[PDB]
A paper describes a structure:
p-Hydroxymandelate oxidase (Hmo) is a flavin mononucleotide (FMN)-dependent enzyme that oxidizes mandelate to benzoylformate. The peptide cores of these glycopeptides recruit two, three or six l-p-HPG units, respectively, as the site for glycosylation in addition to their structural roles. The biosynthesis of l-p-HPG requires three enzymes, (S)-p-hydroxymandelate synthase (HmaS), (S)-p-hydroxymandelate oxidase (Hmo) and l-p-hydroxyphenylglycine transaminase (HpgT): HmaS transforms phenylpyruvate to (S)-mandelate, Hmo catalyzes the conversion of (S)-mandelate to benzoylformate and HpgT then transaminates benzoylformate to l-p-HPG [Fig. 1(a)]. The structures of Hmo and its mutant with or without ligands all have a single polypeptide chain in the asymmetric unit, while a crystallo­graphic twofold axis generates a dimer. Gel-filtration chromatography and analytical ultracentrifugation analysis also indicated that dimers are the most biologically relevant state for Hmo.
A single mutant, Y128F, that extends the two-electron oxidation reaction to a four-electron oxidative decarboxylation reaction was unexpectedly observed. The enantiopreference for substrates is for (S)-conformers, as (R)-mandelate was left unchanged. The spatial arrangement of the substrate (S)-mandelate and the cofactor FMN in the crystal structures of Hmo favors the HT mechanism, because the distance between the N∊ atom of His252 and α-OH (2.5 Å) is shorter than that between the N∊ atom and C′α (3.0 Å).
Author numbering:
A (entry chain A), B (entry chain A), C (entry chain A), D (entry chain A): 2 to 182, 205 to 356
């Protein structure tokens, strides 16, 4: 019986080999951006409203044309067989059963078509390939398999310097492969190529500058994820949570604005919402639950987050996620 | 001989069973709001005035039609027999003898009429019942018994997630019951129902948004308590002390504005006053004193707070609480 | 060989009885204001100037009609025989030989006339007596003995709550007495009585509010000391260093503006100067040096501070204290 | 295999005698400015840009008429034979081979002409001599030997109070001497004397006030180094990184603006650039690498910094250093 997301991190550290726990936990460089994601959420306080009608509190949203049960999706995390033998299929099944979107990775350890067959209306995360037309082929595979959005990762012209991985000499076990199969830096040209090749909404993940948010709308994106890649890319990149309010104001409803990095409770989901997010992504905690207890672990985590989101919303006087977006906040110490 | 309120916490931790100390000490979630209540007071500094007439320093106030000896009341705390066998009666007697108002709880472990019979002009705290007309019956019982104000708790549509209690598996001992006897969320409609059913002042406890303070005045409240429920309700709710000055300015004398959360000395009372509070509530420390030494413990705590309030006021150049409200403050680190 | 003021605190803690070290070190209440005095100085950074003429760097000032060797005086500290058998006479002799003013206390453990006979042009600190005309008699004694200024302490309507002293049960040894011999709160009337009874400059020690600084000038004060009494009076009083710049601007040269609280190096003297102080007082460190090594200890401390002040000034491009007052500062973390 | 600059500090502490490690690591006074250099960088976050062309990322700059491989030079550090027997020659050879400028010190432990003979287009750091025409003789020696800029240190009218050195009784071993051979404070007159005696660019190192930056341009400087001398001069001097943006704006392209103090990664170089620096100096880390492994150690450090700078730039969307200067930043906690 886990009563917070931190109970699951403790359980995952017990089970996983050290080097795999480090691949999961780590960030780039000195891990300043990884720590700052948590700092930034901890400094945000909500100003709750009282005495509102809570007869029919709902945590549901509509996004990219589908109803979701919570304002949350599972973030793209590569190589989930590292954490549990059922890898992506375990997490995808749990997500489906919880009504939350699951992002299938370009570097998934089970093929995208197998994970899409689980059901649950899935999203697909794209890394740009050096071999471009292979890029558009992954996108078409994803669309043919029933994925509902293309989450184009735009913060990885190459992978950051993960010092834990270097120190550990980490490499994929022989038994974990990139099951969908040397990548190139993406540009605004790449975005347009993808937009022209699909009818699915294109979501740019890894935007932090206001002007890049605005350009994303101008480029025809359906959404952005305001994100420093969990502190795994530029060490010293600002947390997404610190940019979110400014970005929300700048796009002024022109696309969905998601945030990630450090979300560890339903109260953090409420903070993100109050700052203007349409939804959040959650990465590491979903992998902790997978490592600890497989599919059932992920189910328990999603049930716990659902309960915490509903609790937080109602304590704050919000019968709907839209009401939560109208909450005010105060930055503390 | 206790020389600070912290001496009493040490004494209560020694005597109480762990799970009961945790019920008392704990907050919701990660306990961020519980910690922030203390942080927020610690960052406030007073700018004292010198060379004023202190011939007749008085700590008295008039509130809800009665003189009180200090700008303080005992906060509503449920189930006080958990802490000492004499429970509410011990605290109520001490409060009476100190000249400070005592708030009788809807979840008192001794009936409201027994505690009111102690004397001391008492207040009554209301939780809204799912069974509404039972709500108005508790209010009428309280008024018939001589309570002087109705403290309507508006921040508990349901109880928060108290992880210490969950982890401990805490439940009331068989020997502690809700002696006044399934509740429902309160709304502004509920407030009006209460206001129409009583001539007593209605005080809304748990207001943090400025606009809710203003609506409270418009709704005919006689007072509000600016409060995050001691960090026991929404985890991430702003401390009341951080909202107080803004709220005081917004109501511009339309009702009494009390604050609670983390008050642990007469100097903290002075801070609250300087920020504009009419009075404060004190919760946990009163229970520490009750656990440590029963009625006499609570008497000692009230005498110590009285001394500290008078000391602080005079060192700050204030012959009256109104003068203290005109002090300026500076936020530090 | 002491190379910083902190070397002397270590030496004094070794020698003094615990309860006497606590009388010296302690503050009121939770000691928040005592800690904040240090915090506040630590957050101030100087913006030094380069490439100025330093041929004739001088640390001298003119104050209350006399040249002083440094922009520093020894603060009033009661009962110096607590620290060393030669008490006040040891400190006064050292101060004389260093060219810095020494403040003789109303609660000195050697009579004011004996300490004045040491020489060095001394100041006299006044506590207002309940018996008023005795007040004016102490002032006249001081003036007859050759004191050069009356430092009227205005922040002690009564003594603060020193919890270390309470816990230790501290009291003066039989062998330490108030050698100049039930006091009353001072008012603006008291200030005028003193001003009318002496031709010496009257300096009000313990001013923190801007308006009290202004009133001090209007009342004919020759100086003020911006001070929270070393955190020994109101617990939660703002540090003087945090008020200084505002106060300096408000009096706009109408009286000398001194500061105290936490000065522990020549660099801290430079900070105080840059914020606009005419001079600083130093309390605890002078007593550490007295406890450690008597007169010679105090001499060593004054020589070390002189060296640090001259070093700091010159590294900052300041050939005179007036130049140091024109330095700019930046508040950091 | 070192994967961060901190790996080299650990290696140098193992090898060097304590008193020599302290000479290198220490600062003046309480070491507040030394610590603040790190604090200040840690509070700066970069707002990276995405989706830019990174086909030809280059870390090169043009400065003082020469191409440099990175926006970095080796800071002047006296007496490098303290750290390794090959001293300056080892560091100069490494710097040459990495394409980065090396600053030859007036207090070098190998003569300036020997170090210049290594090649690599070197700079020369000047301390003003009490014997002035000797000053201009060092400058002419440097120019005759092929140095490309005169880095005039303007923050050392005399050496600061290094308490570690005092406590250790540190002095140069007999086997380390000032191989180029009682100095005097420099003034603006001295700057002009140097400017009139050389055609090389004159760079003033140790400027922190905005007005001194402006005067430097007016005086004909080719550059300034915004610097508190690694916290070794005035204890309480503001970090250069906290002044940099203001200074850059004030000179508005009138000279090159370099910064130093606490640069410990390529990400810190990116921060400095984003705040407007033309280039940085790096001191202590270069000496750590020299102590640990001599010339090859310094080569490894420069290769690691090159990799980190290129990584940071590209993750931030910058194909050139000029693009990096146009990045925005956000100050965090
Ligand atoms: C082990 C690991 C692998 C990841 N792999 C990818 C990836 O393949 N694609 C991607 O866009 N983001 C990837 N991310 C980043 C996440 O999508 C997400 O931005 C980050 O984990 C969110 O922060 P959180 O983990 O603090 O919730 C990865 C994160 C982790 C921890
Ligand atoms: C054990 C406990 C029980 C409480 N029960 C109630 C309650 O029944 N009604 C209510 O309005 N507040 C209740 N509160 C909140 C207090 O009235 C008050 O808002 C909070 O304790 C104030 O903070 P302090 O304890 O830091 O002084 C309770 C608090 C505690 C600690
Ligand atoms: C042991 C002790 C006794 C003091 N006695 C007096 C006093 O008799 N009169 C007075 O005006 N201030 C008194 N003070 C306050 C000092 O004058 C001064 O304001 C404070 O010590 C300055 O701070 P510092 O000790 O941090 O330098 C006393 C301080 C100490 C520590
Ligand atoms: C051991 C040591 C010796 C130094 N000697 C000189 C010097 O002779 N001339 C000079 O201008 N700066 C000198 N400096 C200061 C550096 O040039 C530089 O400003 C400072 O080291 C930069 O900070 P960093 O060490 O944090 O990178 C010295 C620094 C150290 C640590
Ligand atoms: O952090 C991630 O996205 C994941 O570890 C990853 C995989 C491949 C390239 C860069 C990064
Ligand atoms: O915190 C309190 O008010 C107290 O523990 C309580 C009792 C009943 C419901 C919610 C909360
Ligand atoms: O702090 C001081 O001034 C000193 O301890 C003191 C002495 C007498 C009354 C109040 C205070
Ligand atoms: O810090 C330095 O510049 C170096 O230690 C130094 C050498 C000579 C005088 C002052 C300072």
């Amino acid at each position: 019986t886990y009563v917070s997301l931190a109970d699951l991190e403790r359980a995952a550290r017990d089970v996983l080999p050290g080097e795999i726990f480090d691949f999961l936990a780590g960030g780039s460089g000195t891990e300043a951006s990884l720590v700052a994601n948590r700092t930034a959420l901890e400094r945000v306080f909500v100003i709750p409203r009282m005495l509102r009608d809570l007869t029919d509190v709902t945590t549901e949203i509509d996004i990219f044309g589908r109803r979701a049960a919570l304002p949350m999706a599972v973030a793209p995390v590569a190589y989930q067989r590292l954490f549990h033998p059922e890898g992506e299929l375990a997490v995808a099944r749990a997500a489906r059963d919880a009504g939350v979107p699951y992002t299938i990775c370009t570097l998934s350890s089970v093929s995208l078509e197998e994970i899409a067959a689980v059901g649950g209306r899935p999203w697909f995360q794209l890394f740009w390939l050096r071999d471009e037309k292979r890029s558009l082929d992954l996108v078409r595979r994803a669309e043919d398999a029933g994925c509902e959005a293309i989450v184009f990762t735009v913060d990885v012209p190459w992978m950051g310097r993960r010092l834990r991985d270097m120190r550990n000499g980490f490499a994929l076990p022989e038994w974990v492969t990139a099951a969908n199969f040397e990548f190139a830096p993406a540009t605004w040209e790449s975005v347009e190529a993808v937009r022209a090749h699909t009818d699915l909404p294109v979501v740019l993940k890894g935007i932090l500058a206001v002007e890049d948010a605005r350009r994303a709308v101008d480029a025809g994106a359906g959404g952005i994820v305001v994100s420093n890649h969990g502190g795994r890319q530029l060490d010293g990149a600002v947390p997404g949570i610190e940019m979110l309010g400014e970005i929300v104001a700048a796009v002024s409803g022109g696309c969905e604005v998601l945030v990630d990095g450090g979300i560890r409770s339903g109260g953090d989901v409420l903070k993100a919402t109050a700052l203007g997010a349409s939804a959040v992504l959650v990465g590491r905690p979903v992998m902790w639950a997978l490592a600890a207890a497989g599919q059932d672990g992920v189910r328990q985590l999603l049930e716990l987050l659902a309960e915490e989101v509903r609790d937080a919303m109602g304590l704050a006087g919000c019968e709907s996620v839209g009401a939560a977006r109208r909450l005010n906040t105060k930055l503390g110490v």
